[PDB]
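Hey team,

Filing this mostly as a record. A colleague (T.K.) asked me to run one chain through the structure pipeline before their review meeting, and I want the input and output archived in the tracker in case anyone asks later how it was produced. No errors, nothing strange. Just documentation.

Input sequence:
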Amino acid sequence: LMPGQMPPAQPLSENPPNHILFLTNLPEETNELMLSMLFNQFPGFKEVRLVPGRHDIAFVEFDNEVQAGAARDALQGFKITQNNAMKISFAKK
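Output structure:
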């Protein structure tokens, strides 16, 4: 049988994964309202997390701690604008 709600795997490098993804290469005008829409349209969404002093990086949670890893491969390099492509990766707790 399946392992059920199996925990997320590590990214392309050694790192402790968690219920949230690290976004990268975001536009210079990003905000929680826009970031929320581009994740709320997915088959799973819970919350979003921003960091001050930044605009090219952010954090986002999917339906649950498991399914954020699914959105990683699903949103890899979101062409939010002509100069910025949202990279998706596992954040660190």
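Quick notes for T.K.: Residues 32-40 form the longest helix (9 residues). The longest strand covers residues 84-90.
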